[PDB]
Structure formats: structure tokens, C-alpha cells
Amino acid sequence: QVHLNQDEYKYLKQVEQILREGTRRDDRTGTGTISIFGMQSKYCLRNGTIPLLTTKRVYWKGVLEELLWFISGSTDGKLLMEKNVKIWEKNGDRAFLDNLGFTSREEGDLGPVYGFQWRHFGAKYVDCHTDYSGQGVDQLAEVIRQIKEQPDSRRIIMSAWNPSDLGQMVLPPCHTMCQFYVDNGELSCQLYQRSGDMGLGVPFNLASYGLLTHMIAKVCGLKPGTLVHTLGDAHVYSNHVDALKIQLDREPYAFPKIRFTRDVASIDDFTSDMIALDDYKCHPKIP
């Protein structure tokens, strides 16, 4: 049969394939996972659609506020908490920092993570309160320039994987790079994700890069195309198979759609008040 939302059904079949074919391993601390290495899915973004899963609600406020935080170049977790978004709190507090040997680091200074690499790749990091203007490569600005002036390019790439800075990161990048692609006035985006928790993190990442593509599409005067999601270690955690069993038996509703309620002078000119999400209907929460 045809499903109202085929793209999310395929995601459920991804989860289903992992449980059926994946290999059972104990990640390092004992905690087991079910894992397939090498997967790929595509999600249609046309007509403002954004792939926020309907069988299990996604922390939309987190996606939005975190992505703007990435774009701003910030590595200060405290700015995200001032928006009431706690995803980076445990990774930036005293205990977690000291455990990595960052005993001199202010609480919340996550190190040279995503935002720093996107906008200042190759720059000398010191802390999250340093003015890095004009230091390093502005990958996000270069991408936008390539899309506008060289739409046919096959090198429109933005990487967060900086071997020199990995040591000083509280967490190594998970979505390690993405590639953009223009075809018949439509902007597409492929994301390579080295590691993916299909129960929690992966749906969140789909929304982030789906939203990012919609933003870049508007800045470049293009229409949204397709999101290609490539996974390295696509895995489910053993202790959480019950929740996915429930999620899989649910028929997906239609994806919501993004709507930008004002114009923007650049990728840096977005604000939470003008990113609208319409008709996000989900199935009830899962214990």
C-alpha cells in the first residue's frame, strides 16, 4: 500500500531492519546496542515540508534554538539554557568537564564544537567568550556563496570534524559533515552521521538539517529539495526496544511544514519568533 507519509514509514523500516538484522554488541560500559553499519534514507522537503517524526514527538524547540546557536558560532552552553534548552547541560557542567581533564574550564564552555568549526574552522580556540571574528574559515558563508554563484558545484561541503580540536571538545561531532546540491532551482542536502540513536538523536538530527536546508534555501532564493541522511553506526539501545516496538505499530501522520514569516538579509538574520511550524500532529508520548 501507499502510506500518507512514506518517508517516515521508511524510517520505521530502518528501525525494523536494525532490530531484525543488526549485530548485538556492548558499547563499552556494558550497555548493549543493536547496530547496522551503513544506512541511507531520503526525505522530501518540497513545499516547505520538514521531517519531524509523527510517531514520536521531537523536541522542536531544541532543534530550533540549538541550530540558531550553531549558526551564531557560539560554544557557550549557557546561552542555550537561557532559552530553557538543556540538551548540552550535562556535557558542560563541572563533573563532566573535570572527568575529561578540563579542570580549568568554565562551566558550559563546550570547547571548539560545531558552531566554532562551522564559522571559524582552523582557528585557535581558547574559550567560549573570545571574539573569533575574522579567524578561521567561515564554512557556512562559503557554502552560501557557492550555492548562489556556483550552483553546479560538487564541493559545497561543511565539516565539523577537526582532528586538531577533537581533544578539546566535550563531545566529538556526531553529524560530522554535510553536502549541498542544486538542481532545477531546488536545494538539497546530504548529511553524514557517524553515529545515530534511532530512538532519540536521529529524529532530532533530521529536523535540524531539514530546517537548516529550508533556511539556506530562503537565503539563496531557492526552493527546498531533498534531505539525504547517511548513517555510519545506525543503532538502537537494547534497554529501549520496548518503546520502538510501540512506535513501529503507529501509522505516521503527515509531516508539518516550515514557514518563515519575514525576510532575511543573511543566514545570520534569523530569530525564533519568525520560524513557524504548522500542523505538527504527533501520536501520544511513549513511556
Ligand X SMILES: O=c1ccn([C@H]2C[C@H](O)[C@@H](COP(=O)(O)O)O2)c(=O)[nH]1
Ligand Y SMILES: Cc1nc(=O)c2cc(CN(C)c3ccc(C(=O)N[C@@H](CCC(=O)O)C(=O)O)s3)ccc2[nH]1
Q: Which residue from 73, 108, 112, 196 is in contact with ligand X, where contact means CB under 6 A?
A: 196
Q: Is 197 in the site for ligand X (CB under 6 A)?
A: yes
- Cα separation, 11 vs 250, in Å, equals 12
Q: Which residue from 139, 205, 226, 247 is in contact with ligand X, where contact means CB under 6 A?
A: 205
Nearest Cα neighbor of 182 from 158, 217, 208 is 217
For residue 162, what is its C-alpha cell?
A: 577537526
Q: Which stretch binds a second copy (CB under 8 A): 24-32, 51-59, 216-224, 239-247?
A: 24-32
The span from the first CA to the last CA of the chain, in angstroms, equals 30
Q: Which residue from 17, 19, 32, 59 is in contact with ligand Y, where contact means CB under 6 A?
A: 59
39 interacts with, out of ligand Y, a second copy, ligand X, none, CB within 5 to 8 A per kind: a second copy
Q: Which of 44, 174, 220, 282 is catalytic?
A: 174
Binding mask 136-175 for ligand X (x = CB under 6 A): ------------------xx----------------x-xx
Segment holding 18, helix H or strand E: helix 6-21
Q: Which residue from 5, 233, 236, 255 is in contact with a second copy, where contact means CB under 8 A?
A: 233
- Cα separation, 55 vs 9, in Å, equals 10
Q: How far is CA 178 from CA 91, 99, 212, in A?
A: 24, 31, 11
Annotated catalytic residue 128: no
The number of beta carbons lying within 10 Å of the beta carbon of residue 253 is 17
111 and 88 in contact (C-beta within 8 Å)?
Answer: no
Please provide residue 66's backbone torsions phi and psi, each rounded to the nearest 5 degrees. -65, -40
Q: What DSSP character marks residue 202?
A: H
Q: Is 233 in the site for ligand Y (CB under 6 A)?
A: no
Q: Is 228 in the site for a second copy (CB under 8 A)?
A: yes
Q: Is 201 in the site for ligand Y (CB under 6 A)?
A: yes
Residues 6+ apart with CB under 8 A from 255: 5, 7, 8, 49, 50, 51, 52, 54
Q: Is 210 in the site for ligand X (CB under 6 A)?
A: no
Annotated binding-site residues for dUMP read 28, 154-155, 193-195, 197, 205, 235, 237
Binding footprint of a second copy on the chain (CB under 8 A): 23, 25-28, 35, 37-40, 42, 121-122, 136-137, 139, 142, 150, 152-155, 157, 159, 161-164, 172, 176-177, 179, 181, 183-184, 188, 190, 192, 194-195, 226, 228, 230, 232-233
Binding footprint of ligand X on the chain (CB under 6 A): 154-155, 172, 174-175, 195-197, 201-202, 205
